[PDB]
């Protein structure tokens with residue numbers, strides 16, 4: 001049903017809310033929730049851990065089965081798997097891990113995957129343990145994605161910084 005509420009317009013196609021993406025997926029019933037994935041689709045923490053836990057490990061069993069056919073994803077790559085109880089689809093997207101010297105230029109490639117989906121509920125890619133500046137990631141989102149993105153940002157202090165950088 002894609003019932004997004006309380007999202008702040010940043011651009012004509014990029015929206016942002018200070019919210020837990022799991023709680024968002026349960027209220028919004030989005031067609032697509034984006035996972036901040038690693039190449040092995042091992043959902044051990046952050047957004048991936050959160051989404052998987054909310055599926056009571058359904059996502060992790062499907063993910064393994066995919067990895068068995070594919071081997072690992074490419075950095076900048078994605079797959080479309082079931083959203084389980086959270087969404088029709090989960091778009092698992094691998095942003096570069098700049099901690100491991102993966103090139104920040106691959107963040108554009110990661111966001112380009114969003115353009116395959118009319119409307120997405122999504123985190124910022126390559127933030128947190130992936131080590132990219134989240135405000136940089138938002139700029140790459142805005143520059144790259146032309147389909148309708150609804151970004152959920154868990155942390156209020158980071159949310160305010162993001163909105164201050166974008167609108168002030």
Ligand SMILES: O=C(O)c1cncc(-c2ccccc2)c1
Nearest residue numbers: 001002029030031085086087088
């Ligand atoms: O089956 C569909 O066409 C569909 C499309 N978008 C969202 C959903 C959905 C997503 C989460 C919960 C319940 C329903 C289903």
